[PDB]
Design a protein around this ligand. Structure first.
Ligand SMILES: *[C@@H]1O[C@H](CO)[C@@H](O[C@@H]2O[C@H](CO)[C@@H](O[C@@H]3O[C@H](CO[C@H]4O[C@H](CO)[C@@H](O)[C@H](O[C@H]5O[C@H](CO)[C@@H](O)[C@H](O)[C@@H]5O)[C@@H]4O)[C@@H](O)[C@H](O)[C@@H]3O)[C@H](O)[C@H]2NC(C)=O)[C@H](O)[C@H]1NC(C)=O
Length: 315
């Protein structure tokens, strides 16, 4: 019945080279809300900014209103690391959103759960990988959190000393199948002593369109010299989003992942991604049962998040 106001801040984009414009415009949006008394105030480090610095406007279309306020800042003030708060008092109730310049020296990566773990195994996990760090006295702490503030499970901790003298800190967090699918956002804070401030990475399910993959499996003809082995190739394409899991099945058995090589998802010329999978098979396997299945596990695949194609060595 009632629609509460949603506060979001949009900022001036950087150019093609990643350079800041001469002035930064912060645009506060109070979009799609039930009409009522509204006030927008801008704060610079918790202090009320002068009315002349910002310009607001309210527009009513249908049963809902939409208010916006634009604040103009100099490049000096934005680069000074000052925090800018947009304070919206709607129907006497305060709603706030804050922003500052986005937070060199060589990195952290946060992955989404694999479609196989989410849909087949039904035990998804997210991995925070922290790389390119120099050997220095003091541990590297990785902390997991949810946007909802709900509790997280206990994670794993793998530390590896690489050949080049660098260290990799791997944390694997188990997530809920129901939680991920319902759009939970998982964050991983990297508290490092050599950094001044935390390196935070966040992950959540795909936003845009979903398109099921097309699976095609091929068997190479006999090549002179390789009479007792064959190569099976699989083209999995036109899927959206890029998140895909590939498996090869022979004789009602799922072959080990070590048996095959799958490429990384690359864009097609039109819409969607593509992957290739390569499996080397022996005469003993095809003479046992001449059917090898290439299976793709994808979120857009119906009815069970799976699409597959069989291939036989001999016609
Ligand atoms: C010192 O040496 C180390 C050697 O380890 C160098 O560290 C590597 O640095 C690069 C660049 O920073 C890292 O690459 C990133 O990896 C991100 C994470 O990707 C992994 O995890 C995914 C989820 O589990 C997984 O899918 C992915 O695998 C993919 O590639 C496989 C290739 O064989 C392929 O078979 C799979 O199908 C799949 O497609 C990865 O395992 C990724 O998101 C980034 O885009 C980026 O590529 C390496 O991970 C680092 N190595 C390790 C072990 O962590 C370091 O840079 C060297 N220092 C210097 C100065 O050169």
């Amino acid at each position: 019945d009632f629609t509460p106001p949603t506060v979001k801040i949009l900022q001036s984009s950087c150019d093609g080279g990643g350079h800041f414009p001469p002035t930064i415009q912060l645009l506060c949006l109070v979009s799609g809300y039930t009409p009522g008394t509204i006030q927008i105030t801008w704060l610079e480090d918790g202090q009320v900014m002068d009315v002349d610095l910002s310009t607001a406007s309210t527009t009513q279309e249908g049963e809902l209103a939409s208010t916006q306020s634009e604040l103009t800042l100099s490049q000096k003030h934005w680069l000074s690391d000052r925090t800018y708060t947009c304070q919206v008092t709607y129907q006497g109730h305060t709603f706030e959103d804050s922003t500052k310049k986005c937070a060199c020296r060589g990195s952290a990566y946060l992955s989404r759960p694999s479609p196989f773990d989410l849909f087949i195994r039904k035990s998804p996990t997210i991995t925070c990988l922290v790389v390119d760090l120099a050997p220095s006295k003091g541990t590297v702490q990785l902390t997991w959190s949810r946007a909802s503030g709900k509790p997280v499970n206990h994670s794993t901790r793998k530390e590896e000393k690489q050949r080049n003298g660098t260290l990799t800190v791997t944390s694997t967090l188990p997530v809920g199948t129901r939680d991920w699918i319902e759009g939970e956002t998982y964050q991983c804070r990297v508290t490092h002593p050599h950094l001044p401030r935390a390196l935070m990475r966040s992950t959540t399910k795909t936003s845009g369109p979903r398109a099921a993959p097309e699976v095609y499996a091929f068997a190479t003809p006999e090549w002179p010299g390789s009479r007792d082995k064959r190569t099976l190739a699989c083209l999995i394409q036109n899927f959206m989003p890029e998140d895909i899991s590939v498996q090869w099945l022979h004789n009602e058995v799922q072959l080990p992942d070590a048996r095959h090589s799958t490429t990384q998802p690359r864009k097609t010329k039109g819409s969607g991604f593509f992957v290739f999978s390569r499996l080397e098979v022996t005469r003993a396997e095809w003479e046992q049962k001449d059917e090898f299945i290439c299976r793709a596990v994808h979120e857009a695949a119906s009815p069970s998040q799976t699409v597959q194609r069989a291939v036989s060595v001999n016609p």
